[model samples]
Target: EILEEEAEVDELKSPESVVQLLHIDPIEFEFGYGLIPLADANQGGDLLDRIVMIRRQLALELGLVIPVVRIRDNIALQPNEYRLKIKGNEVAKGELLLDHYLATVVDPASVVSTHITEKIKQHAHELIGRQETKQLIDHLKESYPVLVEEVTPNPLSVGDIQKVLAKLLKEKVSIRNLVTIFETLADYGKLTTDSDLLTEYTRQALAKQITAQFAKENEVLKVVTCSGRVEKAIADGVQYLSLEPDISESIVRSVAKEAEQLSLRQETAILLCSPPVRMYVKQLLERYFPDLPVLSYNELEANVEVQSIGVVD
Candidate 1:
């Protein structure tokens, strides 16, 4: 009788009363790299090599069962998405994680390329008198050529710093590792620091100690993501000033301090405003670098996308 009465209530018809059901499909991938903040430079390099080795291993292991295999070319053509799509079909699942290997086995690139080609052909047929399907194929063939080069390809460039910083902003790199790298560069005089070696040492030690404690008691991953935002804001602010490596270090250090104090979700959002660390950051921005842009917290938060995925432990 009570349930029937409640169901009959007019207030229950409100949009807020409607329950939104969400289904989250969990998936995992073993992509050779164990976790972020890769142990050391050698370990990081080894992990990169291991990623290739694992891909080969998977092909070889599969080839033993199915003999007629062109592993080399097939592997390159069948990217992560292809694997995921095939797996999705095999499992009879609707949710697909094309980015994660264990979730599917269909070639994502092939699927995407096929889709794009079909769309272009369809549009050509509609817009023009006759559809030129071969044009798409020709474009692909002309654009992507297999060539053997004598010299090793270098991925880094002068402006590659921006690319690296963008990646770092994405939380791809750990804060500890970022600090370590900066400190290393500073020590070599490739970068400069307003904070002395003793200060740097103290800051790093404190950060590590806090991080270890956070790991033991709470979820450290959450903090890392938060720290990335803080670092990114500082990086962006310094970029406006065009400060040398040394002044940039001080700005970053001050930003790190602000990040450490912030709630995981608010770190980057809060630091963007000529923040409480204004005294330190402003001095750096105005002293030698006068033409630098001054940013507000709102501006930084507006530009940055925060993906807070993990839960507090």
Candidate 2:
């Protein structure tokens, strides 16, 4: 059974009302006609259920509440094609090709759900802004009034705090420990106004979380580091000068190739480097490998054993 509803058209609506409808959604998934069944409630679609689960899963994992997702049907795409959007712009697109029945267990809904989950994680930073930041701040005011007040309206505004959180989210760091995060911000919020630097400090403050994030139980962390040659170049370049494009290209290629090899081996490696050059190296390689974690020495705990998997020169 198909549920039918009247389409509302606002021919005589006010300009303000029409403009209000134009607000861009934080996250949106558009599916083609053929894939509509995957989202149809009457057709046993579990995509909606999976989306709800995705939000909860991320909330626990990243410690930030995700906004509601907007799902709609788009006529422009191919019958099996789907598109994922963030802030009205396309971030990922794919098609669902499924056989009627097979021994293997696979479904169209699962594909869409997984894609949405991964894309949301990758683009979580973009979804957070000053407004959401204020919401998070207000939520903490009840239990931690002084901590909240000190960090905001003084050394840091809502915007400043937002940037710090966003930077942390950009690196896939969990912002669940608001107390520690705010504490770090309060400490350095006076020393330097730079949000990037503040993010570094906040990461260091969450040393245990950072260390446990990558290391396994009773095992050493296998990380990829930049060679002394590359480290010196980045460290010197960050001191006022810029990295030469020629050297930057070589470094990027080397890192990309090594990371790919690690992935092929079914292993993961974090990129660890000195504190001063960590952010610079991240900035240079972000476009190509946004998911790769770039950790500085200060971000790890003192006792966690580390092993060099490979070096990117």
Candidate 3:
């Protein structure tokens, strides 16, 4: 038999505003009056248990440290309304029928949908669980969450993402995209002891995701380029920047400032140059503008419209 159910949702609030009601908890589930029985432990409701199961599944599948979800009662909400929130922000929510299966029609007389719709419940559970978990685990930086997974620790760590290569040389590392960096190292790594050389290999493997951060398909990629001479200064002979030239620190500072200013205006601030110097310039400017993306000319896809916002002369 098929079961019949209905669902409704409410407005989503920012993580900050929604967080207040949670009192610094990891996740929150706000239930409406009508669904109180669904969450009540004394009344045979297993909503909380379901949340735990969902979190556990997400943790196992995504290989992430998931936090416990706190359930709360919201008297202000409609009895049938429900919401799932992370750090006070609602991610997803829907109504549920206590018992029965998904029905094909609205007819009450023939509504004998009998089998429990485990998929809907589980689907809703995963949807809400992943949403909140991602907020806590990945979105903490206020930048954006990079899709991550296990086997991350072995590959390059997050520290490798920033002046990752250069930083690694200076005994520094950042693991923003541990999975990607490590994955690259695993795929391209040779029997080499040099940290700087590995960074180049990793960058090429991650060129697409990095470039996409600033622009999308067929969109104009606005970037500041160096003059012809400056490009040679940072060029490396390999598919990467193999050689580091003696560029002026003042000039590097000036370019870093330009990228920083663009970011201050809420625009994508990326520097463009030949593939060889991509890593070289990144090393040069990573000190001042840690967030600036130094992109290579080759990384920009064929369809993308590349425009030199101006030369950093």
Q: Could you say which candidate leads in TM-score?
A: 2
Candidate-wise lDDT, in order: 0.30, 0.82, 0.52
Between candidates 1 and 2, the TM-score winner: 2
Q: Candidate 1, which ten residues in sequence have the lowest lDDT sum? A: 64-73
lDDT of 2 at 77: 70
Q: Give the candidate order by descending TM-score.
A: 2, 3, 1
Predicted structure 1, TM vs. truth: 0.19
TM-score of each: 0.19, 0.86, 0.40
- Say what the RMSD of model 2 is: 4.8
Q: Candidate 2: misplaced stretches above 4 Å?
A: 1-23, 40-44, 96-104, 239-241
Instruction: Compute the lDDT for candidate 2.
Output: 0.82
lDDT of 3 by residue, 1-313 (tens): 0001111123335676454433555456676787777678798676666656655654444333346657777765667766665544555665555553445543211121111122222233223343443343354334323334332233434433323333322311222354566556555433443456676666556556556656767667667888887776555334544443444565576686667676777777777887766667776665566556677766665567777665775
Cα lDDT tens digits for candidate 2, 1-313: 0111111332425765556445388888887788787777787777788889998999899877888888887666788888888987789998886434222565666767778888888888988877778888988888999999888889898888899899999898999999999999889889988998899889999989998888887787788888999998887787544787798889989898889877887888589999888888889887788778999988888888888778998
1-313 per-residue lDDT for model 1 (tens digits): 3223333543456566633111121211211122221212353323233334443443232111111111111111212222111111211112223343332455432333334233222222121111112221223235332210110011212132222222222211222233343333234322322223223332333344323322333322322222444445455655234545764666555544444455454532222233333333444544434322223232222323323332111
Residue 6 alpha-carbon offset, candidate 1, angstroms:
64
lDDT accuracy of residue 17 in candidate 3: 46
